[model samples]
Target chain A: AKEAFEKIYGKAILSFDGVNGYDVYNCSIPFTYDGKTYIFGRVEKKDEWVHSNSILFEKVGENRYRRHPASITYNLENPFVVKIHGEMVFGGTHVTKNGGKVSDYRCEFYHGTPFNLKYFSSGPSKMKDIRLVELADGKIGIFTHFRTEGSCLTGFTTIDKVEDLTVEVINSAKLINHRPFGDAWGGPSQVYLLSSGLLGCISHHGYLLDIQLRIYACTSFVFDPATYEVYNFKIIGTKGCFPPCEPKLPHLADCAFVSGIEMRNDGKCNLYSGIGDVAEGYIVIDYPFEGYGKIVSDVAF
Target chain B: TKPCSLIPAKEAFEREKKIYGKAILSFDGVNGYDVYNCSIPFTYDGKTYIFGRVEKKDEWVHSNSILFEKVGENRYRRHPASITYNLENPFVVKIHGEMVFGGTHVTKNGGKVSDYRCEFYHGTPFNLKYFSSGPSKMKDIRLVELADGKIGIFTHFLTGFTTIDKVEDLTVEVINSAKLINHRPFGDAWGGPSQVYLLSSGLLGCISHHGYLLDQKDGIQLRIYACTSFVFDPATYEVYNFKIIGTKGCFPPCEPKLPHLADCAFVSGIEMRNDGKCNLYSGIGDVAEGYIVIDYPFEGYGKIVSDVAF
Candidate 1:
């Protein structure tokens, strides 16, 4: 997958200006709201955790972004965004502490326009990588992951409206795949509705190396929300798919968190991701779900 | 509500009885700072010294470990011959004919403690020098000499245990790769060893700190730390006799630096008495230091062999 990615469309690191001493990564896909394009990034010092903040970065040049002058920053990590019920919804992981040590975390959320997001809800404690998609049938598609008895599995379920999301509703999602990527575990990074009535999932999975170090990569799959079945799961890209970069920790040397993908009209798609947890980058590749289906909704990109 | 591990501490606080009580004073003689999280008094080079984290009452950054010598029955003054360093929550143990001392080394940016690592040293009190440190973002690392002269290390982040050949063999990589110690006294609450010792039955005894949080009505989260003890085998990771020994209520009420730290009690050391009772020394509420006389926490265990589970 890495070699194929490099051969087809070369990748490059996204240049970020501002946030001088902090590393920026795990960003939302380049999104347009009220006519300007922007990316929301997790920014913090390389050696620190639980100090992260999601800062908005406006696209200023080709593959380059700058921190928005009037952007509001939130104490969150791994920012994601989607248009839910005609409103721009933002989400990230909020870490909870027991004294100075981290004990739990939850997915925090805000819903509003890009410039005026307001806090509304949160996910179950100790869960991350949650995603929501607006289906063609006007229902909301939810993707979740569960770690039960040493194995992490992906689940899918639907609701009639976005406000129906709750602990009971999210926990009731049906398992779409069991240990989906073998010993590695991950969940949906971004989800899109397809013209074929399926869900296009740009996901991630990671496993520990023999030396106890970890390796994460971007992956993709096709899922049926109606029947709760997954198909055509494949590794779309790896950390090596991007340019050389520094890692936050030695154990995280090969991590690449896929955020979202933008399909161009020129038979290719631009994939955005957090590289090594220290920087952000993107790569253009052939359409990942070419034979399975094509995305029909413009709400996600 | 509290976790199952803290039930004994809650009960101990309710039925508390005071045997002896006094406050250690005169710390401002050397520096205008108060001491907290002190180590139990131990003798080194013919003089008894208690090591405590010294800092101004207004802030927590740049905390230094000061060696205090006993002047009265309940008073401690800074030792004139002591050498201090920028560290917090000090602990010491004798390992392979040398005194091994360690504390949390905090490095700050813009006044706040940005990051910290467990820094260690070896040699006599006045001559202690730097050696090695634990992995990043770790604290409360305790080391004990095994019955066979090997080194046993106790770490936080799930209360793990590991063994090494010598003091020089300890490193960040070795510390991070420690195996899981099968016993979890606190259930979901986080805890780690503060002091470790060898028992007569060839088992290891540990004085540890476990804590739970109180999410207050006004959205302020407060911490509650308790002193606990458990007995374990050094050869295998087997553990037994897990019990809570002390809480903040055992000491007199003192002013906290903040409301969030009101319920903290850090157990640093223990002294066994001739009568079968023991004195447990701990830092109360992160503001004052005190000790309480209690029944020896690890009494009924340590008789079983390695292959047996009690």
Candidate 2:
């Protein structure tokens, strides 16, 4: 019998400074630029309701990050970044609210230098978890998420170049039929183009354990962009796999939002996540996509 | 929270040996409409008949089930005594010496399927009467008589056992509350029991179907269905030896009613013979009937050492 999941190792929380009394979580996977490593975090205060912004931070010590002095803050949540064609492309969910209520949410993309990224386009309205990866043929692959009556589903499509990204193209993506059966939804957080031309994805799946209590976990799967076939779908980590921290709401206590993972030189990898929506942490574990293939690219515009 | 151990349908399909004695059944007298997804051919009231979903060749909706009388080798015709009903994917089983027939009824609103449920009928084939229905929005509800004369109900996602002392006590509540056996073996596929038989060894042998989607990179999503078998102990709800038994290649290549159903092979019935082999009847690509001869699925397993009757 084959085991479905792997146990994590060396779990810990990341420490942040200069957040202006706001918590730093839902951060992007750390990446190196120039000579130092940096990350982007969704910064918000305790007891607040999604009044968040993406702030770029520079790593100053081991597991310690400080707000970059020259960083430009953007009005977004759940910041993510990747390199495409030698340029850094950053993105996040841009939520438009009216009087403390969310009116609209969609993914916004920007491409340029690490510190001076410029906004160019956005995804379909009301769609979240839209990700892009560069294929071996220099085309841009896209992932999409939508919901029906009792289920939320995933989709995929591609464009020839970054300039070809449009609302109509993203809306026409072919839906992958493997969805959570009842009252559960999930979306891709990070994806890598593998050496075998398949995509290895890190995703977050959530459902209500109780009427008011929501639980989330980190999941992994392999996808074929050419055929839109999904394989090796399994949960990799849960809230119990990481360090405990206070939740923004009691109902969110079991949340573990997987932002991304960085493969190590050896057989292990580091998984980064937003814990309970109130803190940021990571765990070292055997690479979830070890047997699939080597990562060829995780960047696309 | 359990890990999925379901064998990938493609991988399992590659390993299946080409089953000999398999042939596509021809229905001669259905006007011009096609019959498919039919119940296994069964002998009742001194004649053999098969109930099938009847629809025009090019359409996918508004179909119903009709009974067909087997006339000769690989041949059948619409039964003269049959009455059509608004149902799909018909099935039949004998419980307590009375025939229990069931199929899915789709209720439509604004030309779209609003809800569907498994509707069951009881009594003899000549005058079957509607007695009960499964939970709303669920299909593949099947019943089998246990060794102790208890009725075991199976539902979607391969739900196993929820036994009752008598068939008269079956209700929607009991079916909705059936305990899940956690028999899902594949990560991305979902299935349920199509036929459950009480083996001579006192265990239940199931011929079922598991389905997944294949994205054609176009806007089309092709649905893949494969025939599978598994053995389970009704008393303990422990499932064992689950594997795929057939795929589309096991039968002759025929056009599907819709392009998306090209790979569907739903096994709805099986007949065991005395020579350690059996015939599996399946709905081929949602448009025709086919059967294959294979070895008995449950060979070496024997009775469970428990308080249950065999």
Candidate 3:
């Protein structure tokens, strides 16, 4: 969502590149639920970033997927996760809303608060992409991002009682902060749990700190699930457009902004791979967003 | 292993220059380690802050909490305080410029549910000069001061905060942000508020507690759940978020019954530090330990080999 988002705002989410076709990019992360792997990303055939809904793709191949679209709302701006147990199909919602006029104060009211999508409108809302997992308590957990200090994912888990099972809001990331959309100082993120810790493919762009307090994007952060503390943060990939010929930091090596994290070999091996989506846009001879580009290189460590 | 260690990794870091470390000091009964008795250590302006009950002092749990600070990695200063505020949780933060702390606590552990309350306050490091204790009504506070200077507290119920008037009074209203009973820790969200905060953009976030249905020596006993941030219209207190984090995994081997056996690893606090590491300071249950600090990348305890070997 880095450069892609910047261009959307710099020009407009619907500005064309060449003649007609729009950009189809910005898939954050992927997870397997039931039998299929999906990406909770938006295919901009003109979803218009806040105009329409987000999409859910059925993984077809490497960096490949099928429209397998779903018009899910509030779940936009997603790098989703999902986990299903018996009759449950659980996930998350990306409840971050920004606009003109009341943006600042309104953001103040919403920022740092739990996104309650099931409000007066969207009935007990389900959103963006959900990274679901069975928790230590033998219960199911669903996590998603909130437009907070750093697109930190807020969590909620279920309380199981055969007849009275229900979901409750919870937290997974605290102290995890990052700029979401640059000028808006916002970005995106995706997270998963490791047997001994937590993993996130998050964006770290702009001058403001990105959870790690460092300016980076599509970086990899190894976290301590014990406290959501960021450790060993390495820029695994380049999340947004390399504005200058190169980055200011010599070590800001170029790599893809991981859109997802997946492990294979039945949990026996350690081939953990993070997908980097080099989300960028071609400036129309008539348009330019060189100044504002990808705000977050969404990646999972 | 490239000498994979930081912070001394083996530094006999002590306190008062006294250097504190233990390996089970031999005790029969104490109460500084419980789910409700946990939070994470916090660091502000370089000093690593840890809130712990003076376990060595039997009366500790009853009314003796110590606020300790380890400067850099050396001298540890255990703030000796009998501060009556009981909920041993502190969300250390910088407010109004000065470094202050805010958190919810049990004003009075009354009967049956004993003043099962959640309150918020802002106090200096050691003593008073604190924000007046908030209405002991709603809990799980830790509000956010918007970019424009408006503070709105978020919780599972109605909330209030410092407004533009600066009169110090707040406007209280119903957010009716309640969830199902079976999903919460006590089968009720009525007054049980956990650690939560407002993200950069208004999306409310939270930390939930569950587990211990039975006293099994297994890992599935205590857990943390994270869910998606549902949407809400700022103009109106509308809750449009769903997808409660972690709930449908597995239940305890048995239901929670009375009279259980010994349990290890009591969570004292879980803190995400600016030094960039998530830490869970636990009051070690096995032996001589005041608080066991578990680093993020929560390894060693439950390391999984992963699915592949790339």
Candidate 4:
């Protein structure tokens, strides 16, 4: 059955290779235009660069073939894209292998139509794991992790135009202290914006049993047209289900990995994660929009 | 005439029907009316009057002397009033005394009155008294005194009359008169009406009839009062204070089958049960449908492990 499926399926010209194995860490729905569907996925190469890859396929006769721009790779990975009026707006993290540092990054809209061939900026050390979303009103809202030399910080950014892709700190280092070997690891942070203007973020740190996941939620305030800030950052602790990270369980070492954040249509934000040794990861945390704070001001910060 | 011939002639005359027939003769005119020939002879004092035949010669006798004395001019006193003027006597007689009649008439000098007749000619000094002509009428009048020293008039025609002084008036005084005065500033006019269920910290609770939860220093006033000019005091009455404590709005009206609680503030049904830190039920209904548990109050805010039946 595997051989028959492979025969009929026929691999794409650029198939998955073990050298830089590609795993769809996060996948989003296809953006359809002119009767053709274009699906995008964030593929990661183990201990290396993570990139955004687009798969373009068209039906020809009885079989499907790879079309133009078969797979376009970018330096950014874990790309969460939102199509606003046929414009693809993507945001992710830009990791530097040599420096071993991940910064808050983003890629503006590329081609006028399908949005292709975009580059990311390795600007400030304060930014990490940036996710962009298109608000109801033609504006773009960005959620990212804000890092400081001594403290761990997380916040969001708002851009009026695609060219203005930069990290604007909102919620400062309010709760977690992101320091290396200082009992805190602040690399992978995921942000999910709910319908109620409540921004939820799951931050991961430490190693083994010391692996700690903190779910922080707050309401975003627009201090001005170009600036947005999150206030009333509340720590919603996970009770009992997952034990404290201090006493690590060796058997379930892979389960300690935290991946991405996704919010359901019903206003529930889920934390998608991966286990280090486990083949597949699972959802680690789920939070409802119940106890989140309310948006007070429209002024941008 | 010869004695023997006269005697026989008298006997024959007595036995024969005379010029007046027997039916026409009056009982008083009958010569042997007092005489009887039954088992015993009639006796008065210590003497017995024997029965005799009608032909027996008898002589008519009259008392030798008359006993009469004049005590006063048309005024006399019976030696013993109970015996001379007794009520058992067949013939009617007049009696006089210094008696009081009804409640206000007093008889001082005395007066004359006919038998079986009530006379009120003389005013009496007594508060209430009645005068009857004879003992028969007097026996029918029933009178009794009550415990309060006032007379209670009870008669066959009338039910009874008790003096007001005799009744002990019992009045109870209310201690705490403090009440919940609600000041609503929303629905009807600025004063919107809301019902409140007041639960005391000690487990006592009452639903206010008409009121809103007002933040009074003494306690929460669950009442409906006009906006201004309403003052609430919590010292005398139990007030629900929501400052230190927490209160939730009941919001919309409840179902008919359920309790019809008004728009009032209610305490959160979530509480810590057993040794566990927090066990809470969502909404205001039973826990079976949907409920969540947590360690503290804010814990359930963002995250909850729900036990959904469906």
lDDT of each residue in A39-135, candidate 1, tens digit only: 9998877786556767788888988888875554555789999888888878888654432345556676666788656555566667786799888
Q: Model 2 clash pairs?
A: B5-B185, B6-B185, B6-B186
Tens-digit lDDT string for candidate 3 (B1-310): 2221211211222111121222222221123222223334555445555544332322122222345555434233443221223334444433443433444433221111222223233434533222233333444444434335455444444332222322123222222322222222133212223333334454333333222322235634422221112232233544443222222111112122122312223333334445544333333321222332223322222221111000
- Compared with the true structure, all predictions reach lDDT values of 0.75, 0.75, 0.31, 0.27
| TM-score of predicted structure 3 | 0.30
Model 4 CA lDDT for position A118: 31
lDDT (Cα, tens digit) per residue for candidate 1, span B1-310? 5544665555775586445543434453444567889877777655567888876788655366777877766677776445455478998888877788888865432223445678777777755655676776899788888778788999886878888887867777678889889855557667889888877687888888887776877778878788888898877888887777777777677887788878788888677766767778888878788888887777875431211000
After superposition, candidate 4 runs with Cα above 4 Å error: A1-69, A83-86, A95-117, A120-122, A135-139, A167-193, A200-271, A277-287, A291-301, B1-310
Better of 3 and 4 by DockQ: 3
Tens-digit lDDT string for candidate 2 (B246-301): 77778888898888888889887677656657778889888888888876666677
lDDT by residue (tens digit), candidate 3, A143-215: 3335444443433334342222222232332334322232322232444444442444343333333442333
- Candidate 3's C-alpha runs over 4 A off are A1-301, B1-39, B44-46, B53-61, B71-77, B80-88, B99-119, B134-139, B156-167, B170-193, B197-202, B210-277, B280-310
Tell me how each candidate scores on DockQ against the true complex. Answer: 0.01, 0.01, 0.01, 0.00
Listing candidates in order, what is each one's chain A TM-score? Answer: 0.93, 0.93, 0.45, 0.49
Query: Evaluated against the true chain A, what TM-score does chain A of model 2 have?
Result: 0.93
Best by TM-score: 1
Q: What lDDT is reached at residue B14 by model 2?
A: 61
lDDT of 2 by residue, A1-301 (tens): 1234536768889998877557889889888888888988888777876566688889999989988855445657899987777788788876643322455566777778886565566776687778888877878888888753444778898887675667778878898756432345877888888888888898888866534567788878888877778888777777778888888988778899998888777768888999988888998877777788888774322
